[PDB]
Write a protein that binds this ligand. Structure first.
Ligand SMILES: [Ca+2]
Ligand SMILES: [Cl-]
Ligand SMILES: [Cl-]
Ligand SMILES: [Mg+2]
Ligand SMILES: [Mg+2]
Length: 1059
C-alpha cells in the first residue's frame, strides 16, 4: 500500500510520468493539475491535497478517480489557476477507510509571468564594457544589459533582470556615439545600432550591411519570473527574412536547414529514428546563418530555438533556468572574415578541436561480434588477405560485462576499498588468454586499438563480487551524483543501463578513482584509447553533482565531462591515444572523434548520417564518423555498401561497424564479409579503390585535420559554409566540400546513376579523369555504382602519397612514418598558396605557391625546402621545357624513365598532367613550366549528339576522340572557361580528316562562325587549326555543328584555349 506524487517526474522533455504536476512550472492563468497514484486498487480510498497559497491555509482539494492501470489507481486534483507572484505549497495524501495515511511532499511552486525590456534610460561606457540601464514592461526590477566584445567581430550580451549582477569585461577597441534616441557602438568589424525608446538592437557589419536584428515590435528581450524568488526562463526574438537559412545546432539528422522548426538543445539516446523524432545525442546551442553571423547561447540548460516556426519572419530562443535569480542570460552574436571564421570565433569561446594522431584518419575496423582472441586474429588475417591496410581497431565485447574494466573470463582475487588492479593480478583464461600479446599483434598489423566504455556502474540486481565491492565503495565515498535525498543517483529503470549508478565526472576524486581502475589497460596492456559510449543518462531536477549544479543544468554537460575526462586520462599515459564517442554539447570538439550513433542499413539512414555530419561540422565538430552503410537491420545491399564506401572514404573519419553480438551468418560490415553476404565479388575491388584513394590523399586529409585544430575550419562542410551568398547552395545535403579544395557528390539515393551536382561559379576539374566543368549551374554526372563524382577547385594544390604508378587508387599501404612518392597535384589558376603539414618530417609547415601565367604560356611553382624528393602533377598541356632554378631538366619519354630519373619531367597524355620531379634540397627551388597552356578540353568528354568515341588512331590526348563525325545533325558541345578573364582567345582545334577538307559551323554562346579543317595525310595524322573566339566570364557554350552547308568526316581529339 502507498501513495505517490512527484511533480517533475524524471524531468524528461518528451514524455511525462503518470504522477506529475501539469504544467510542471505554472505561469499566471494556467490551470494546475496534480496527478497522483495509490496502490493497490481497492474500494474506500480517499485522495486529497493539503496546501497553502502565500502561506494561507486553503480548503483541502479532493482528487477524483481518473483511471486504473496495473496494480494502481490514478487520480487528478485540480488546484485551479493562479496569479503572478503566488507561492503554492502542497502535500498529496491518500488513505483507505480513514486508516493509515501515505503522503508526498511538501512541494512548492512560484507562479510566474513574462517581463520584458522596455526602454534604455541611461548608457554607461566603462571602456571595456557598456551598461544599458533599462525599464521593464512590468514588475519592479531595474534591468541592466551589458555589452562587451570577445573580439572586434564578436559581441557578447549579458542580461541581469534585477540589475544586481555585473557583466564581464571584453576588448577596449570600440567607440560609442550616444544620443537622446539612439546609441551606436562601433569597431573596425561591427556597427551595433541601438534604439532607446523602445529598446531595439540591430547588428551590422562595419560597412552598414545588416547581419541580424531584434524583432520589429521591440520588447524582444524578456525573463519569466514571480517577481520575488525565481527567474525560470529567458527569451529574445529576432527579425528574419523569408530566405534566411539556419545551420548547425549540433548534430541533426532531419535537415541541415532548420528554418521552420523548433530545435531542442537536449541530448538524448534515440535508437535508429533520430531523423523522424528530430532527436540527437549531440546538441549545441549554436547556429550559423547564411546571412553571415552565428549565435551562441552560453548555457548548459535546455533551450528551444524557434526558427520561423511560429511567426514567418521571427526567430527566437527560450532558455531554461533553475530559478536562481543570479544566473544572467549570456549570448553572443558572432561575425568574422567568412563563415568558417565564424566557426573559428565560436571555438575561441568553447574550445578548439584537439589535433589527433594521423592513425585516426585511416580506416577503423569494428564489429560487436568480435568477442575473443580468435576473432581478432581472424579479422587481422582477413584484412591482410584482402589487402585492407586499416589503421584503427575497436573492441566492444571485450570485458566481463559487469565491471567493464576486466577482460572477459579473467580470474583474480577481488579487491575492496576501491583498490585498482595491475596486469599481474589476473589469470587470463578462455576468450582472452593474453590481452597484451593480442594488442601487440594488432600493433604489428599497423593498427591501433580502442576499448568500449560507459560512464555508469552497472547494477543489474545480480551478485558479482568485484562490482558489488566497487558499488559500495563508490556510494559511501560520495563518487556518484545524489538523487536529491542523500541516496545515489541511478539511471531510470526503463532506460539503457537502468538502475546503474553514474560516476560524477564533476568530482575530481571520483574521476581519479574511476580512471585508476583502467590504468593497467594503458600502461601494461598497451591500448590506444577508448570508445566512450553513452552519456545521455542524467534525468531528474533534484539530481545533484559535486559542483553544486543540478539535473537541469547538467544533463547536456554530463556527456562532455565524461568524454573529456577519459580523453585527457588516456592521453596522459599514451600521447597517441584517441577517444571515439557519440554524445556531447558545446566543447565536445576538444575531445576526440564523434560518430553518428545507431542507424539501420538503408539509403534513408545514409541520407540522415550525411545531414548529421554536415550539421555537426558547422557546430565545430569536425572529426566526425558514421557506421558506413549502417550497423544494424538487414545486411546492406551491394549497392548501398558501395555507395556508402565511397562517401566514407571522403569523410573525416572512415569506420565500419556492426550491432549483433553473436550472429550467424556474420554481420560484419567489412568488405570481405560484404562479398560473402551479397555474393557480389566486385565489392572488394571497389572498396580497395576508395581505401587506397583515401591513403593517397592522406597528406591532404591530415593537413585539413590540422587546419581544423588551428583555424576552426571543419574537414567536411555544407556548401553554404564556403559559398554563403550563392542561393543554389543553401539547402544542399547530398554534396559537400572536403578539405579546402574538393567538392564531393555522393550518391545517397537508391537506384540513382544520374547525379546532379551544383557547381559554384569558378572552374571545377574531375580528379579522376581531368574532365573540366565550368561552374554556375547544376550539372548531370553519370555515376555507375563504383563511381563517385569528386572535383577540385581552381588553384588547388593537393598533396598526395603515390606509388610509382602515380594514379589515384593505388595501394601505398599504411606506413605513417614515410611517404612513397610525395606528390602535389596542381590546378593552376592565378596565384595560389598552400601550407602543407609535413608530419612525416617533424610537423614542419611547408608553404607551396603557384603562379599561373598562361597568357605568357608559363606556370611557376615555388617549392620550399623539403626533406624528400617531390613530384608535381600540374594540369596543363605539354611543356616545351621545364626549368628548376633556371636550369633545364630532362624530358622523360615514359613513366619508367621518369621513375628512374632523379630530376626531370614527364607528360601524362591521358590525364593531361605534367609530372615534374625535384630533388630534396635544404633551400627553396623555383620550378617553371614553359610553353604550356590550360589543359585541353577533350572532345570525348563533351556533350555529344549522334556521334560516338574511339581510341583507334594513335596520338590523341585524353582517353580517345570523337569518331565518325561525318553527317548533318551531328554535334559536339564543350563547356569552356576564359583562361585569364573575359577576352578574345585562340581556340586550337585538333582533329584528323583523312579523306578530304572538312568544314564545321561553330557557335560561341550563340554567335556563329564557320571553320575549315584541311585534309590530313591519313587518319593516323592529326592537325590543329586556330580559330579566333571571344570568351566571357562563367561557362562558355561552344558548339561544333555539321550543318547543311558543311562537309566531310573528321575525328575530333580536343580543343585548347590559348592567348
Ligand atoms: Ca581526346
Ligand atoms: Cl545616457
Ligand atoms: Cl596536332
Ligand atoms: Mg577571429
Ligand atoms: Mg603505446
Amino acid at each position: 500500500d502507498g501513495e505517490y506524487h512527484s511533480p517533475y517526474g524524471d524531468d524528461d522533455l518528451y514524455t511525462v510520468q503518470p504522477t506529475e504536476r501539469s504544467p510542471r512550472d505554472p505561469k499566471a492563468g494556467e490551470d494546475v493539475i496534480l496527478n497522483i497514484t495509490t496502490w493497490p486498487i481497492e474500494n474506500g480510498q480517499d485522495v486529497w491535497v493539503e496546501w497553502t497559497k502565500n502561506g494561507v491555509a486553503q480548503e483541502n482539494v479532493t482528487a477524483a478517480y481518473d483511471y486504473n492501470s496495473g496494480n494502481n489507481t490514478y487520480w487528478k486534483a485540480d488546484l485551479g489557476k493562479f496569479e503572478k507572484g503566488d507561492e503554492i505549497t502542497y502535500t498529496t495524501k491518500g488513505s483507505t477507510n480513514g486508516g493509515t495515511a501515505y503522503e508526498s511532499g511538501p512541494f512548492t511552486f512560484y507562479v510566474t509571468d513574462w517581463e520584458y525590456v522596455q526602454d534604455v534610460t541611461s548608457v554607461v561606457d566603462n571602456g571595456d564594457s557598456i551598461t544599458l540601464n533599462m525599464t521593464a514592461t512590468a514588475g519592479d526590477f531595474s534591468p541592466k544589459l551589458y555589452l562587451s566584445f570577445e573580439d572586434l567581430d564578436t559581441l557578447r550580451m549579458e542580461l541581469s533582470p534585477t540589475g544586481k549582477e555585473t557583466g564581464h569585461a571584453g576588448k577596449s577597441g570600440y567607440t560609442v556615439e550616444d544620443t537622446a534616441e539612439k546609441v551606436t557602438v562601433t569597431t573596425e568589424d561591427l556597427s551595433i545600432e541601438i534604439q532607446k525608446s523602445p529598446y531595439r538592437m540591430e547588428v551590422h557589419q562595419a560597412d552598414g550591411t545588416l547581419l541580424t536584428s531584434e524583432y520589429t515590435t521591440a520588447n524582444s528581450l524578456g525573463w519569466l519570473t514571480d517577481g520575488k524568488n525565481v527567474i525560470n526562463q529567458y527569451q529574445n526574438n529576432f527579425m528574419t527574412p523569408s530566405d534566411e537559412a539556419f545551420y548547425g545546432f549540433g548534430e541533426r539528422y532531419d535537415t541541415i536547414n532548420q528554418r521552420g522548426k523548433d530545435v531542442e538543445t537536449y541530448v538524448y539516446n534515440e535508437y535508429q529514428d533520430q531523423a523522424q523524432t528530430e532527436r540527437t545525442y549531440l546538441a549545441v546551442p549554436f547556429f550559423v546563418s547564411a546571412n553571415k553571423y552565428g549565435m551562441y547561447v552560453n548555457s548548459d540548460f535546455h533551450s528551444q530555438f524557434q526558427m520561423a516556426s511560429k511567426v514567418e519572419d521571427k526567430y527566437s530562443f527560450v532558455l531554461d533556468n533553475d530559478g536562481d535569480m543570479t544566473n544572467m542570460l549570456d549570448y553572443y552574436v558572432i561575425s568574422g572574415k567568412d563563415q568558417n571564421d565564424i566557426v573559428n570565433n565560436y571555438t575561441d569561446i568553447t574550445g578548439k578541436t584537439t589535433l589527433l594522431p594521423k592513425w585516426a584518419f585511416g580506416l577503423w575496423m569494428s564489429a560487436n561480434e568480435w568477442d575473443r582472441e580468435s576473432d581478432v586474429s581472424s579479422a587481422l588475417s582477413n584484412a591482410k588477405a584482402n589487402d585492407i591496410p586499416a589503421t584503427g581497431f575497436v573492441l566492444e565485447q571485450w570485458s566481463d560485462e559487469e565491471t567493464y574494466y576486466i577482460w572477459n573470463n579473467a580470474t583474480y582475487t577481488a579487491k575492496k576499498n576501491g583498490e585498482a588492479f595491475s596486469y599481474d593480478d589476473f589469470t587470463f583464461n578462455g576468450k582472452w588468454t593474453d590481452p597484451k600479446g593480442m594488442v601487440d599483434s594488432v600493433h604489428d598489423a599497423g593498427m591501433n586499438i580502442v576499448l568500449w566504455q560507459v560512464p555508469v556502474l552497472k547494477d543489474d540486481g545480480t551478485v558479482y563480487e568485484q562490482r558489488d565491492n566497487d558499488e559500495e565503495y563508490m556510494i559511501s565515498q560520495g563518487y556518484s551524483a545524489d538523487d536529491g535525498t542523500g541516496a545515489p543517483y541511478r539511471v531510470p529503470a526503463s532506460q539503457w543501463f537502468g538502475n546503474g549508478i553514474l560516476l560524477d565526472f564533476t568530482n575530481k576524486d571520483a574521476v581519479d578513482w574511476w580512471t585508476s581502475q583502467r590504468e593497467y589497460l594503458l600502461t601494461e596492456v598497451g591500448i590506444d584509447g577508448f570508445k566512450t559510449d553513452g552519456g545521455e543518462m542524467v534525468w531528474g531536477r533534484d539530481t545533484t553533482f559535486s559542483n553544486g549544479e543540478k539535473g537541469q543544468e547538467m544533463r547536456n554537460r554530463y556527456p562532455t565531462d565524461y568524454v573529456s575526462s577519459y580523453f585527457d586520462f588516456a592521453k596522459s599515459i599514451n600521447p597517441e591515444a584517441v577517444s571515439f564517442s557519440r554524445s556531447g554539447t558545446s566543447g565536445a570538439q576538444k575531445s576526440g572523434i564523434y560518430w553518428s550513433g545507431d542507424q539501420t542499413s538503408t539509403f534513408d539512414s545514409f541520407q540522415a548520417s550525411l545531414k548529421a555530419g554536415l550539421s555537426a561540422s558547422t557546430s565545430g565538430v569536425s572529426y566526425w564518423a558514421w557506421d558506413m552503410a549502417g550497423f544494424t537491420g538487414d545486411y546492406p545491399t551491394a549497392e548501398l555498401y558501395k555507395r556508402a564506401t565511397a562517401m566514407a572514404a571522403f569523410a573525416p573519419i572512415m569506420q565500419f561497424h556492426s550491432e549483433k553480438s553473436d550472429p550467424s551468418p556474420s554481420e560484419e560490415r567489412s568488405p570481405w564479409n560484404a562479398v560473402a553476404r551479397t555474393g557480389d565479388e566486385t565489392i572488394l575491388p571497389t572498396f580497395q579503390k576508395y581505401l587506397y584513394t583515401r591513403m593517397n590523399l592522406l597528406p591532404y586529409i591530415y593537413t585539413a585535420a590540422k587546419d581544423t585544430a588551428d583555424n576552426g575550419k571543419s574537414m567536411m562542410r555544407q556548401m553554404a559554409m564556403d559559398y554563403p551568398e550563392d542561393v543554389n547552395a543553401r539547402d544542399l545535403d547530398e554534396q559537400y566540400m572536403f578539405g579546402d579544395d574538393l567538392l564531393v557528390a555522393p550518391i545517397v539515393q537508391e537506384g540513382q546513376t544520374e547525379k546532379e551536382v551544383y557547381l559554384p561559379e569558378g572552374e571545377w576539374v574531375d580528379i579522376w579523369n581531368g574532365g573540366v566543368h565550368p561552374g554556375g549551374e547544376t550539372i548531370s554526372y553519370y555515376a555507375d555504382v563504383d563511381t563517385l563524382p569528386v572535383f577540385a577547385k581552381a588553384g588547388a594544390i593537393i598533396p598526395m602519397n603515390m606509388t610509382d604508378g602515380y594514379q589515384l587508387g593505388q595501394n601505398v599501404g599504411n606506413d605513417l612514418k614515410s611517404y612513397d612518392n610525395l606528390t602535389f597535384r596542381v590546378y593552376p589558376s592565378g596565384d595560389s598558396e598552400y601550407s602543407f603539414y609535413d608530419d612525416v618530417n617533424g610537423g614542419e609547415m611547408r608553404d607551396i605557391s603557384v603562379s599561373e601565367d598562361f597568357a605568357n604560356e608559363k606556370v611557376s611553382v615555388d617549392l620550399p625546402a623539403m626533406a624528400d624528393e617531390t613530384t608535381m602533377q600540374v594540369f596543363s598541356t605539354e611543356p616545351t621545357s621545364v626549368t628548376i632554378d633556371g636550369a633545364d631538366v630532362a624530358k622523360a619519354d615514359t613513366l619508367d624513365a621518369f621513375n628512374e630519373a632523379t630530376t626531370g619531367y614527364y607528360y601524362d597524355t591521358v590525364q593531361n598532367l605534367t609530372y615534374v620531379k625535384a630533388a630534396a634540397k635544404d633551400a627553396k627551388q623555383a620550378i617553371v613550366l614553359n610553353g604550356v597552356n590550360h589543359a585541353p578540353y577533350e572532345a570525348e568528354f563533351g556533350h555529344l549528339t549522334n556521334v560516338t568515341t574511339a581510341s583507334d588512331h594513335a596520338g590523341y590526348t585524353g582517353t580517345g576522340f570523337v569518331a565518325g563525325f561525318d553527317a548533318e545533325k551531328e554535334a559536339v558541345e564543350f563547356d569552356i572557361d576564359a583562361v585569364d578573364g573575359a577576352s578574345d582567345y585562340t581556340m586550337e582545334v585538333r582533329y584528323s580528316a583523312g579523306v578530304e577538307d572538312a568544314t564545321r559551323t561553330v557557335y560561341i554562346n550563340g554567335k556563329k562562325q564557320q571553320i575549315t579543317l584541311p585534309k590530313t595525310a591519313n587518319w593516323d595524322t592529326w592537325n590543329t587549326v586556330e580559330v579566333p573566339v571571344t570568351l566571357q566570364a562563367g561557362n562558355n557554350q561552344v558548339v561544333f555543328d555539321f550543318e547543311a552547308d558543311d562537309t566531310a568526316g573528321i575525328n575530333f581529339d580536343h580543343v585548347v584555349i590559348k592567348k
